[PDB]
Each structure stands twice: as structure tokens, then as C-alpha cells.
Structure 1
């Protein structure tokens, strides 16, 4: 990709005891224009892996198609093996690095959640190929706005519960909506646990504007 065109705002992910939860807004902005306000920037890779992207939505759809095809083929094989979230993370890192080396990178920053063998996985894949695993992740303006709160809470309490992680993610979404021009009120909470990947419907933030009257 060379022109980002329709872009994504930010994806925040955090791991709790029992799985991982990620969140993303439902907005694809051409420039400063909202334009598409109902797209989904989160996909279910398999029963134990989830994926959220920030950047060119066309590249996100291309990755969706490719990953879905790989999962379908592996399921067809039926040999009793499943792509672990770490394997998907490695594959995405390799693909992004190859595209970067070809001077035609995919303009998305990807957050990979998962829960396999009783181990929460939370991966980060950038445009160039920078890959790492962290207890909390945030792309775009997330790394500046939401990441502080996530890191503070985690370094305070190393392990969170599902409800605590969801509340923290909702607070981060509220902050991002308050202080990000490319953010949107409607977002999408996706959680992966032992049961599987569960993607919640469109949720809105609790706006507060008392400071407007305070002045």
C-alpha cells in the first residue's frame, strides 16, 4: 500500500485470567470524513484466535480473505492440529516483513488475541514487521492515550479478571473517543476465552461534558 485511504483508528487489547479481550471502533475514515460508520475491524481467525487491525481497510480485507482461506484449508485437512495464536502471529509478522521488503507494505497495525492450552496470547504486528507480545497493547493514538492507563493498572495488579479487563477497556475507549478526532462513539468488544471467540455488538460510550458548562 502507498495511500492509506480508508483507515482505522486504534485497537486496544489486554489479557486477563481466562483469555484476552480486544476492542476497536466501527469507523473507517477517508480523510477527516467519517464516511463508513458500520464496518467491523475485528475478525475471528479460529476458535482460539482473534484479530484486529488499524490502517487501510482494503489490506485488512485482503488479510481476512487470506487467513480465512488458510483456516478453512487446515480444517479440511482434519489432522487434529489447529493454528495456535502464536503461529498466526508469526505468519503475519513474516508476511508484513516480506511486503515491506518488497516496498509494497500493508498499511495496517495488527493486534492478535488468543487463548490456547490455558495461556493468554496478545500479539502486536506493525507495518514494517516489528513483532512483540505484551500484556496490554494499543495501536495508533491508543499507544499514547489508552496504553498509559492499561500499563498503570497492570503494573499495579499483574493479573485482571474478565470484568476488570472489560471495564478498563471501556474506560480506554471513552478516553480515546474524548481525545481522538478519528475515533467513533460506536465500538466493538471482542473477547476470546476457553469457550471460544465472542464478538459483542455495537456499543457506545458514556459521554460527559460538564466541563463545557463549567466555563
Structure 2
């Protein structure tokens, strides 16, 4: 992809005690047009990992197809081995870098959340193959808006409860809806625990607009 078409904006991620939570709105934008206001930008890659994606939605659908096939292929063997979140992250890094080096990138920026062997995983992957691990992640405008909030909390309290992380996420999605012109008040939250991956349905964000009546004074 040389020119991205229908795209999705920010994707958030944060680790918590015994799991990882990820958020992303359900909007596919055709430029400034909110064209497809009901699409999932979060995929369940097996039971230990999960993926959120920013950028061109078609390329994300491609990666979704490919990853799904890989997981099926592995699940067919039943040899007692499965793809760890770190492994999926490594593969995705390899793929994105491979496409980058072919001068034909997959126009995506992705956040992989996971929980395996009692450890919480959170990985970031560029379209150029820039990848890393962090306790909190934010793509697109989130990286300018949500990430500062996330780091503020995590440097004052490294370990969060699931409810705490969920609250943080909700507030960040609110900020993003306020300031990101290509976002949408309809998002999804996915969670990895030892119980597996769970994607919660269409959520809305409460909005305050009292500062509308502060024109004069």
C-alpha cells in the first residue's frame, strides 16, 4: 500500500495485574469522512494474545486473514505447543519489516496485548518494522494525548488493577474523542486474562460540554 484509503485512528493498550487491556474505536474513515462507523479493529489471535490496529483497514483485514490461518494451522497439530504473544509480536515485526523492505508496506501501526505464563505482554509494531515492549501503548494521536496520561499513572503506580486500567482507558478514550477529529464516540475494549480473550461490545463515552457556556467570562 502506497496510499492508505479507509483508515482507523488511535489504539490504546495497558498492562494490569494478571492481564492486559486494549481499546479502539469502531470507525473507518475515508479521509475526513466517517464512512464506516461500525467495524472492529480488534482481533482475537488465539486465547493468549490479541491485536489492535491503526491505519489502513484493508491491510488490517489481510493481516487478520493471515494470522487467523496461522493460528488454525498450528491448532491442527495439537502437539501441545502454541504461539505465545511474544512469538506473534516477533512474527508481525518480521512481516511488517519485510513489506517495508519491499517498498510495499502494510499501512498499519499495531498493538499486541497478551497474557501467558503469568506475565502480561504489550508490544508495538510499526509499518517500518519498528517494534518494542512497554507497560503502556498508544498509536496515532493517542501517542500525543493518551500516552502522557498513562505514563503519569504508571510512574506513580506501576501495578494497576483491571478496574483501574479500565477506568484509565475510558478516560483516555474520552480525551481522544475530545481532541482527535478522526475519532468516534463508539469504541471497543478487549481484555486478556488467564480466562482468555474477551471483547466487550459497542461502548460510548460520556461527554461534558459545560465549557460551551464560558464564552463571555
1:105 counterpart SS class: coil
Runs of 4+ in 1 over 2 A off after TM superposition: none
Displacement of 1:213 after TM fit? 1.2
1:171-215 Cα deviation digits (max 9, x unpaired): 000000000000100000101101000000000001110000122
Displacement of 1:120 after TM fit? 0.2
1:72-92 Cα deviation digits (max 9, x unpaired): 010001100010000000000
1:159 counterpart SS class: coil
Displacement of 1:3 after TM fit? 1.0
Partners in 2 of 1:168 and 1:54 — Cα distance? 20
Provide the residue aligned with 1:155 in structure 2: 155
TM-score normalized by structure 1? 0.99
Displacement of 1:150 after TM fit? 0.1
1:108-148 Cα deviation digits (max 9, x unpaired): 00100000000000000011000000000000000000000
Provide the residue aligned with 1:86 in structure 2: 86
1:189 counterpart SS class: strand
Provide the residue aligned with 1:191 in structure 2: 191
Displacement of 1:2 after TM fit? 0.7
Provide the residue aligned with 2:25 in structure 1: 25
Structure (1 or 2) with the greater strand fraction: 2
Partners in 2 of 1:112 and 1:202 — Cα distance? 20
2:182 counterpart SS class: coil
Q: Which runs of 5+ in 2 are unaligned?
A: none
Partners in 2 of 1:101 and 1:126 — Cα distance? 13
1:207 counterpart SS class: coil
TM-score normalized by structure 2? 0.99
1:148-177 Cα deviation digits (max 9, x unpaired): 000000000011000000000000000000
Displacement of 1:32 after TM fit? 0.1
Q: Which runs of 5+ in 1 are unaligned?
A: none
2:70 counterpart SS class: helix
Alignment of 1:111-150 (within 5 A): 111-150=111-150
1:156 counterpart SS class: coil
Report how many aligned residue pairs link the two structures.
215
Displacement of 1:8 after TM fit? 0.9
